[PDB]
Amino acid sequence: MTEYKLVVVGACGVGKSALTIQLIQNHFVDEDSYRKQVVIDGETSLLDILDTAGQEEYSAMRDQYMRTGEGFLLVFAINNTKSFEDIHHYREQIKRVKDSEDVPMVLVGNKSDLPSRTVDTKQAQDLARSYGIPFIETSAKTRQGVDDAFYTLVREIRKHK
């Protein structure tokens, strides 16, 4: 059976864990690794997911997970300008470790339910256009865009293969 190794990257506190918990466990309340079999477009596959900001203890496991990772969610929060500014560093880091220019990625703007916004949707759309990747607005709290973000990434991985 097909397995997809997914890595969710972004600054501390953007909601990487929250998004992954919503996907896998279907809840939100206000584990760094998750594993579940799902059906996407009629195809069964196991999602093996790591959430990481890059500053975690097991660095060796991280570079490993980066080399093996087939697709990446690049996550920022719409109320965290720095987290948006950090996206380029994460994308550049992935490219370098994968030693590749065609790595499946999706840009995710999380916390879309919050009324504090400091990152414009246009800013993110423009960035994603430059990178040639999808941009999806999400809320781990309301579930907005959560399946869409991860399933879009799986579809990007299929295109690549």
Percent of the chain that is helix, strand, coil (3-state, to 5): 40, 25, 35
Kindly state the smallest distance separating residue 8's Cβ from ligand GDP, in Å.
8
State which residue, 91 or 141, has the beta carbon closest to ligand GDP. 141
Query: Distance between terminal CA atoms of the chain?
Result: 15
- Which positions from 47 through 106 interact with ligand GDP, judged by CB under 6 A? 51
Kindly state the smallest distance separating residue 30's Cβ from ligand GDP, in Å.
4
Q: Is 110 in the site for ligand GDP (CB under 6 A)?
A: yes
Tokens at residue 60, please?
């060796």
Residues 81 and 119: beta-carbon distance below 8 Å: yes
**CB hemisphere CA count around 135 (13 angstroms):** 20
The 115-154 contact track toward ligand GDP, x by CB under 6 A, reads ------------------------xxx-------------
